[PDB]
Design a protein around this ligand. Sequence first.
Ligand SMILES: [Cl-]
Ligand SMILES: [Mg+2]
Lengths: 250, 231, 243, 229, 244, 240, 235, 241, 111
Amino acid sequence: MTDRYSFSLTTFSPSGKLGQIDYALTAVKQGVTSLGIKATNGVVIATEKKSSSPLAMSETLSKVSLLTPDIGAVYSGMGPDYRVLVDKSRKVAHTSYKRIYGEYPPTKLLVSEVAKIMQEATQSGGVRPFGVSLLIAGHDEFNGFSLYQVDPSGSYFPWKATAIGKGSVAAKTFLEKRWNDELELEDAIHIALLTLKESVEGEFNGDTIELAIIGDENPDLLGYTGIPTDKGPRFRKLTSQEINDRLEAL
Amino acid sequence: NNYDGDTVTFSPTGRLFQVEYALEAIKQGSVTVGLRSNTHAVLVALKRNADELSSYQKKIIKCDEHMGLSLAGLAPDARVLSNYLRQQCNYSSLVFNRKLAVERAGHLLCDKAQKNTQSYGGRPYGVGLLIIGYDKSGAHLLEFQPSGNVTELYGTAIGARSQGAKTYLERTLDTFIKIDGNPDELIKAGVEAISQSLRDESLTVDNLSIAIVGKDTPFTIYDGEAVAKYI
Amino acid sequence: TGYDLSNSVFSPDGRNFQVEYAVKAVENGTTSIGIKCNDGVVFAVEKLITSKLLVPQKNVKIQVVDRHIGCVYSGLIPDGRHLVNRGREEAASFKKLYKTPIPIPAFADRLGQYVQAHTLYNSVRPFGVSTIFGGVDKNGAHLYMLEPSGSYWGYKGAATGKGRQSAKAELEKLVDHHPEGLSAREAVKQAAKIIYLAHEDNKEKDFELEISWCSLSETNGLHKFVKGDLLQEAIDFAQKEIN
Amino acid sequence: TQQPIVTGTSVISMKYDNGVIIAADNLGSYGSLLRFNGVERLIPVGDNTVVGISGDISDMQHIERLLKDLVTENAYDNPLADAEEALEPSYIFEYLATVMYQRRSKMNPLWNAIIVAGVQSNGDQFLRYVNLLGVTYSSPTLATGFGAHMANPLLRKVVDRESDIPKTTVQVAEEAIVNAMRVLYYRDARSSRNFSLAIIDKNTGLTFKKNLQVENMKWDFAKDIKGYG
Amino acid sequence: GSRRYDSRTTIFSPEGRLYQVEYALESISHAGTAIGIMASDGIVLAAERKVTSTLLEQDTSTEKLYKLNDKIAVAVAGLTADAEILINTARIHAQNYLKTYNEDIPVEILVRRLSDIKQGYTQHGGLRPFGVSFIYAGYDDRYGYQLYTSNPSGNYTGWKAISVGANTSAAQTLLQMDYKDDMKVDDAIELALKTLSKTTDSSALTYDRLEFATIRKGANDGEVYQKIFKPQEIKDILVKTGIT
Amino acid sequence: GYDRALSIFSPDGHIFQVEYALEAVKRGTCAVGVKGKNCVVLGCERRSTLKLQDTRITPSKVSKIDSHVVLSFSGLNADSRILIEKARVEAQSHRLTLEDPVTVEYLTRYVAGVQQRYTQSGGVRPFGVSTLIAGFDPRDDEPKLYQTEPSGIYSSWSAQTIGRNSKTVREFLEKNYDRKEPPATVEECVKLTVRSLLEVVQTGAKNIEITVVKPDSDIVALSSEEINQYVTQIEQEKQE
Amino acid sequence: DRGVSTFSPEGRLFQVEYSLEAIKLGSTAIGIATKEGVVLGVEKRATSPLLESDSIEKIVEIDRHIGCAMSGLTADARSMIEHARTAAVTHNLYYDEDINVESLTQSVCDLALRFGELMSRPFGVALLIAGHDADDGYQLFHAEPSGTFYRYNAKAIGSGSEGAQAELLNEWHSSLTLKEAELLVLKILKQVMEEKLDENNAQLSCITKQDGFKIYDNEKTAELIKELKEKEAAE
Amino acid sequence: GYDRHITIFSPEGRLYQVEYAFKATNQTNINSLAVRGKDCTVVISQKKVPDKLLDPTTVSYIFCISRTIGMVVNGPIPDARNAALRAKAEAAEFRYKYGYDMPCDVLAKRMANLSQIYTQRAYMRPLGVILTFVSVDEELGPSIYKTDPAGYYVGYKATATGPKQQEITTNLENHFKKSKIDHINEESWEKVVEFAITHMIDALGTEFSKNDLEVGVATKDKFFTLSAENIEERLVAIAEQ
Amino acid sequence: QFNPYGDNGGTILGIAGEDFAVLAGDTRNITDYSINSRYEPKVFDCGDNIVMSANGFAADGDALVKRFKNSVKWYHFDHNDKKLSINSAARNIQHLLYGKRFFPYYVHTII
Ligand SMILES: [Cl-]
Ligand SMILES: [Mg+2]
């Protein structure tokens, strides 16, 4: 046995293209649409819960994932690749930061670590790139609210608002017309729901849409009282009911 | 064809071509004969020279006081396999105060050769061996192929033109098995057997190589004027 | 195409062609069988006499694992030996940790997982043998047959090699005609017959019969070779049936 | 490096004209506590060898398992496993001696003294000793622990040198062994009355005697002994 | 076995060229242009962000210009993710040197170390090379202000003015025409922006499409300051130099 | 680890990876070595395709391995740094254990050994570099000049050139260098080295580098103006 | 591509057979064994007149009683020589004696087939190993990259080998003197060399029991070349 | 075209080896079904013994992973047993390290993560199996979680796997559209097994004897398989109404 | 604490004549005040006309002799059945002993 694939499976072609990265981006393009919008007092990330079967319980499949109490992530592309990246991202937030500094990493640095893992799958021996693009939203004390995109190459870029996957080209145009620097969080959620309706074919409700925010601190979700400086997570996943309430004022 | 690039690949008819190509190296090698009675076991080997200035390549290797072999094919591979036998004979003596059985020696050689036929990167051994020995169950003769197949025989031959000597032994089977307590007559039968594989060349004093092991006879090799008696 | 050049590659059918090619090496080998009897198992094998120069009864093919398991195989003989060596390591470590001798189903899976592991990577070749094996444990007699893919099942009777179709037909008759079961001594006799009948596929060269058995009453649940008078009796019974 | 916990006392043995005799009691001591009263310390290997072990019992049970595995391993691909290629006493001893010396050389000994008694293929008597240090020696009589100090002197009166072996019958040899076991019971504080005895003869084979007791004991003279002066 | 799938990333062509290095250089030629200009009183680093969007958060964005320590910075051309791997290694090397000798690492030593890492990927390991070219702008007390470049081959060279990425042929000709040895930082700022303005594939050069940085001894007295320009500060210097 | 045999034999008995490494050397800028009676000179070509270069800080072509030995090269620049580093480490290791600096031959033998090793080790390609190693043995006034190549063969030379258009400058040296009477002075040796490069270089401006090594660790690099005076004097004699 | 340890359909290792082709391109080396000593001679073959020919080292000392000549990719020989020297010295350390010439040769040939996917390829160089020991006297061996070694009364390797070997076939007899052997190597080298043979483009050496292994001076070889010329003009 | 031999992306962003591993899944020609009751989870699978020489008691594609977790496999037996051994090892290790019984959904995730690795790492091939894990979880109650060669997994109200999965899937969909609940509203597991068998008969259009089926049942604190005689009693009850 | 060494007593004597040599040793083996054996051979014929005795701790003594006998066997295999001379045997034994310099063979050896 032994892993005898010690060589790169991603290489430069004569034209200077890294084929496997391009092909990974193609897989992301086929993926279901997900988006992110940044407001003055928050960030929203959203996607469609494309259920593979109606017998499947789509609540058990989480496309929007908490990475830290103040950082969340959504994807477009290959779901299994995303799931393992979330596991690695959660762990690296502890091993390379919280166990050293006693606090959770700022959004930009956690993104940097996730990017590094994705870059290494593009150069290391006997592996293919990750077939996902991530949208990571978060807050931290000194940088405030932020939203980042991470691609299969390991490249990452900050956004005011963006979309990835199936109908990203149309969705980004829709966001350019609606986005301004004076948006409140509720306004950004409203725009997110409007944008996402265009790329969804079938049912459009709280059970088929997954949406989370990075906003105010939620002391009710902390699980303990008595420490004034601990005020709770800024990441909150919206319920099915909370989404449907905002679809009436749509 | 497309399935002979390495030893890890079966062909569509379930053949291992790299092993078969290693088997071909034996057929190119010089002839060697093995035969035994109930008291003694004999190796006879036709040594091959490069030219008239060169020496004749040695064919027989001693493994222990009671065991040794003759080779045909890649000589360095025989050195590796014979060295392994020397160690295994030696381990048996040191640890268990026990002379290694010839049958068990065959089993160890089989398993060593097998590992090189199922793994990537390596290659099969390119040599065939005839192992003789005398242990607690009497005289023995073994034939080793680098496929892993080891066989216990009364007599045999391997190398180029080995079929002639093998047919002779098949006729003489009933006679030479009965040559008990007479080492010279058993060697005579082996020399007469290897003669059935000669063409153009004949058995000279520096051409012929003989080895014998038996009841009260340690494994000894005869070369030079020691084999003139049998020419 | 090219899906058959490397082990562990799925073809567009969902097949591993290298494993299927290993089966061809098994089908090319000599006939070997296994019969499950009332309180044990019997193993038998065809040994082709390539030449008069082969020493009779010396080139033993059937192998013992621990003291209660017998193993026989058809195909590449060295591959079978390698698998048995592993089986012996597995049985030893089991008995080391758990004290009791390895049960037959437990032992079957140890071989099965090891053979299956040789279909997971292109750095290794699949086994070129189908192995028939079994014995007696605390829950009684068990007979198994294990293929190059790692696939194995329990059997009432089992056969592999060049004369497997002939053997299988003969084994199927025994299952139908004996629903209550077969005795150990009967199974030895029947095993001899089936190898002799299966020898029609290898009729060019004459052969040597080799039989072994594990029985609770006849061998105290230990693996033993059939020798001397009991072997000759089974040969005579076999020779009488072909004529 | 360890210390022995549960231990077995003397193993005693001797040669006679046609074979060898070996014996050992059935006690497992836990320091001064006579904890376990049914411990077999003579372990037969085939029909031609008996290995007698003293010292640490946990290590004895490990050695017992090695010998059991040795018999299994010898039978593998061996048609003559019950004949010409059976395990000899000399093979079993050399194996153990190797293990004992290797273990002392890693500073992790099997805390035992071992006597291998048996008869070879050619009828020759085999009797040899090995211990935790890998030290080996042979003699017409051999004993471990207290047996070395008390049994050997008695057994050496029967067979003093090599030439006394053909003159010593099995009846005389067994008698001497049984008497030695009684003396050890009188004088060893970590011994028991119950013991096992094994005879390996070139003609009659292996005879293994269990549940033997020390008998014909002299205690009556104790009644007359009064005070300390 | 596995050999079948090996691209063999570390071999020579019949002409004695390294295939993967040459192809990595082809990749870099499509990246946004980065320019470095060295003056007597400082160094300028200018670089063009690739076809941006109005929804990109520019003030928190960094794709081109990175700080290695207080005295050394780099402009990137190529795969950003590849660059960040090397950048972090270089930052560690600088600190290792500072811990060992209690002096800031000389610019060339840092450059040589990174270049040797790149070289290794071309000679052994069977991995693809880093698709990155760097411009190093730095200062030390031995050689003063220094500009270097390195590419995927691991070769590095020193420069008075240099460009990497897209349209380097055109950019280098324009720099070779207007560069003089007695030039000052304020003049070099103007040259760097004028060169990018002419070589750019975009319709017009604006603040949102640029990253800019200076290394000046314009730091109060006998010390060196690194200035990574803010979006508004790039907008101001574009008006000052008369481009917008 | 990556173990792939990149340097292997071909049916005609050639190792193509080693031969292709020589083609990389052919592409490299020309380097020349000439030994006089009491000195060795190393000349090097600088391609003038690169202006706006900072010559203060740009890696110089000639590298000191120790105070008494120098190394120049033709081929891949990045590859040469690895050989230079290893050579410098071995020079200090030799001083540490033998209590004497390396001989020029010993240092050459070491570097050549490294180059050879990379032609039959798994997972590695040969160095695309040939070197000229020059200097003086400790307490010895006999000039030394050696050459190495990717295969790992090495040898001593009265005069030698490597790199692009080296065939031409070797032609020049073979007719102009007399063994019975080598360049007796530093001047004569430098002049012959500049003359040899002027057959190939283009302009005699910043395209020629010259380094003179004398006995007892006396190594100096000539400046632009000093070399320019040789360039001037050569062509003024040529106009006749 | 294909394995480095692959067998051909004829039963030969591709890489070993290909390395033998590289050895055919190498410069000529000749060895002759006599009862008075073994002579070793090589063609230097300088690629240019500016190359100082005395730095061409194709004859090498392994120990006092064992010498060695090479032909083929001579850079590959350095690690083989290193191992040979180490094996010779190590055996003297372990056994307080000289090592047998055969045993030294066998140790060198054990390296040959240690290649795969250990070194990445076989050696591209053949060696003539000459020496003396008490048991078997004066000996000459031919060590190949196949791992095989043959003893020879006389042997030529390199580009002019088959022509030289045919000449050695006729000329060698069991009563040759050392002086006769020296002239014979020079004669056959001169026959197969491209350039005209002299003391600067050819090199001689020998091994005797008394004096051990000695590389001949250019002045000493020059006299033996002059002695050769005169005796050929004598008939 | 070596992008079809190992798990690297094709130009369309596809992994052909993964897709072909899905095809290997149906090589056994066996259909399985899983449903949830109030207090239980039932799994049924077709059993086919084509050879008379086989011991039918050893032919099985249902595995007892832990005391609480059961696993049915759709795919070749060697890969099935590979997955079974690993799942057993993982479930035991979990209990040792974390002091409580591994949940069904967590084991599914773990095996799915392992499967994901085989789609990303080149030297390891995907296993040609679909794994359906069943239990009565102490927190989530009756649970069905299914894993495939892509590394995908999800919870199910009910599920079906095999060549004729679509027919069974649609049959189950139509039932849950009527009842408007996420489970079989039934007290006893015996009747939930009867439901499972009935709806398989309806979907496939085939009758079953006691030897044609294989049944696994998960309850609180144990998973077990039914004997041929236990299945016979189930078949009798179906026929009598 | 475990003591890996012991003392088995015994005495040995080697004398070199003009054209002969003798190596003598008593046959008694002991521990403390007990006799283990009255006849336990201590001087051994090792082949090639060499006799050897390693006196002191008998386990180490037996190990050393066994390894030297083995070294003679492998000397024959490796060097064409050449006779191992007494001086060569002596140097070889030095290396066997010094190989365990930091965990010595507790013996005094004579050949
Ligand atoms: Cl996991
Ligand atoms: Mg894979």
